[PDB]
Subunit: 68 residues, 2 copies
């Protein structure tokens, strides 16, 4: 599950690192793409893991804050 | 090394989750603190791991973009 999530994001990181090392994208473009990727990982871990210990009356507030 | 980094951040996450579940902090305050924590983890992984495959002429540009 999480390892399959990790593998998909590492394959995406590698796609951007390869474009960078191949000289098709700039270092700035590459760093911004990695940050976008890591931000999606952060939001997804909060929704799939941290959410489990949130009190039921706060579940709606938590989901909107995490996604927005 | 990385496991000692992981343990320190998990102890910080637990501090905020405990304050939340104890009712001392709001769900919003807790989510914003977790996001700050995860953002520092993202920036630190880019500087300690991704940096290793950056071309030497881009190392200065990479460090400033990651930190700023």
């Amino acid at each position: 599950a999480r390892h399959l999530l990790t593998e998909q994001e590492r394959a995406t990181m590698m796609y951007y690192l390869a474009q960078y090392r191949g000289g098709t994208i700039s270092v700035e473009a590459m760093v911004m793409a990695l940050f976008e990727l890591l931000n999606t990982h952060a939001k997804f871990s909060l929704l799939s893991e941290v959410r489990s210990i949130i009190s039921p009356q706060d579940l709606d507030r938590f989901d909107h804050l995490v996604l927005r």
